[PDB]
Amino acid sequence: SKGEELFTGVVPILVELDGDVNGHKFSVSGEGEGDATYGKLTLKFICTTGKLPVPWPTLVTTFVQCFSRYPDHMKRHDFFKSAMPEGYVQERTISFKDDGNYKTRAEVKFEGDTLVNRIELKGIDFKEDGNILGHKLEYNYNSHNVYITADKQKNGIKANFKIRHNIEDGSVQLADHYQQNTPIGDGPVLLPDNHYLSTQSALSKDPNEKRDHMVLLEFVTAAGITH
Ligand SMILES: [Mg+2]
Ligand SMILES: [Mg+2]
């Protein structure tokens, strides 16, 4: 199909987010590249407004699942690439257990040859000395499965998953994710059978970077269907 062919090589990525969490307003810019042939993403994010008022890991899922590797036998289930180049809206509610929530609305599409993720994020109901506003989360990331189901009435998909953020005391802060994707354009899109994205992420720091930032290396493979 047309949109999957846009991803057979290395594709430059731009991410731009504006956020307001409990009235703390901030912006982040990111750049990198994806190689969906290998399910591979490399991204660097910079807080352009100063210090990020929430922990970097809490934003990883919000900051391009079109770069997932869909095995050849699963290509007919790849909604994300099928919506390209016109793109898709991706919306989430992220519910931090015993704390606040983020609501995100993003548009993922090509601008020229560059894959862009533009996000508005709103966070409310956070506790002033909870794990988020209190910055009690370790700078690391666990592996998780993203469970995808079709949403035919919206010509799109939904997903549900649980992200676990490690707390500095050794405990875990659960972030329940509910997700909806809808295509922006008028091209045909693929409505998938149930499957999941097996996702692993590593966070690091650029030793030469003094702005508040995050480097992300992520690998994602679609799975759960055998033939
Ligand atoms: Mg291929
Ligand atoms: Mg731990």
Residue numbers in the entry: 2 to 64, 68 to 231
Question: What did the original publication write about this model?
Answer:
Green fluorescent protein (GFP), discovered from Aequorea victoria, emits green light after absorption of blue light. GFP has a β-barrel fold, and the chromophore is formed at the center from the three amino acid residues Ser65, Tyr66 and Gly675,6. The protonation state of the chromophore differs between the two states, A and B. The phenolic group in the chromophore is protonated and neutral in the A state, while it is deprotonated and negatively charged in the B state. Spectroscopic measurements of the photoreaction of the A-type chromophore revealed the presence of the excited state proton transfer (ESPT) reaction, and a photoreaction model was proposed that includes the intermediate (I) state in addition to the A and B states.
